């Protein structure tokens, strides 16, 4: 969980999901 929140794509997924 900590690794996920590290910055592997936390904001790179939500925005992408909306666009997608």
């Amino acid at each position: 969980l900590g690794l996920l929140s590290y910055g592997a794509g936390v904001a790179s997924l939500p925005l992408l999901n909306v666009i997608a």
Side-chain angles (χ1 to χ4, degrees):
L1 291 170
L3 296 175
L4 283 167
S5 65
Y6 195 107
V10 176
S12 81
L13 245 164
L15 292 170
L16 279 288
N17 178 285
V18 173
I19 293 169

